[PDB]
Amino acid sequence: VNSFSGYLKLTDNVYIKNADIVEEAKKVKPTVVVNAANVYLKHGGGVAGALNKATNNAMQVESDDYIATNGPLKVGGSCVLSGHNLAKHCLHVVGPNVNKGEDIQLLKSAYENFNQHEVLLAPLLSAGIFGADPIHSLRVCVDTVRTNVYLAVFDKNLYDKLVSSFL
C-alpha cells in the first residue's frame, strides 16, 4: 500500500491522474519524482521550470554543479539528484525533444530509466513542450516501465483523451 490517491489504474503497474505534478509531489512527498529534463539540466519551462520554481531555484543550483562536474546528460539518459522539498530524490530524465529533431525511438530508452526505481511520480516523457504525441508517450510508458509509475497529467482535456483512447 502507498499514499497515492485518486489515480485511475491503467495496467498492473501504471496509474494516471489529472494533476499538477508540483502539487502532487508536495502532498505525497514520494521517494522519487521524475523531471522532464534536458541534457543541460536547464529547468526553464514546462514540468522542469515548474518543479524548479517550487524548489525556490535550489534544483537549478544543484543541477549547475552537477553539469560543471559531469558534463551534459545523453538524450534518453538520466541522473538522480535531490528532491529538495518535493520528494526524497528527483530522477532527471531526458526524453527526445521533437522540437529539436531528436529521434523519437529514444523515448523507450528514456522510460527504461524508470525501471531502476520501485515507485515513481512522473510526467509523460517528451510530452508538452517537448513536442511528442502524449498518447504515444503513454503507450511507450506502459510497454517499457515495469515498476510502479503514477503519472500526473496537468491538462484535464488531455487526461480525458488519454484515458478514453487507452487500449
Ligand X SMILES: Cc1oc(CNc2ncnc3[nH]c4ccccc4c23)cc1C(=O)O
C-alpha cell of residue 71: 558534463
Q: How far is the CB of 151 from ligand X (least distance, A)?
A: 9
Q: How far is the CB of 130 from ligand X (least distance, A)?
A: 8
Largest CA distance in the chain: 45
Cα dihedral 111/5/9/13 (nearest 10): 40
Assign 3 to helix, strand or coil.
coil
3-state helix vs strand vs coil in the chain, percent to 5: 40, 20, 40
Q: How far is the CB of 70 from ligand X (least distance, A)?
A: 28
Q: Does residue 96 bind ligand X (CB under 6 A)?
A: no
When CB distances to ligand X are compared, the closest residue is: 127
Q: Which of residues 3-62 bind ligand X (CB under 6 A)?
A: none
Q: Which of residues 117-156 bind ligand X (CB under 6 A)?
A: 123-124, 127-128, 133-134, 153-155
> Of 44 and 72, which CB lies nearer to ligand X in the complex structure?
44
Q: How far apart are CA 48 and CA 125, in angstroms?
A: 11
Q: Which residues bind ligand X (CB under 6 A)?
A: 123-124, 127-128, 133-134, 153-155, 158
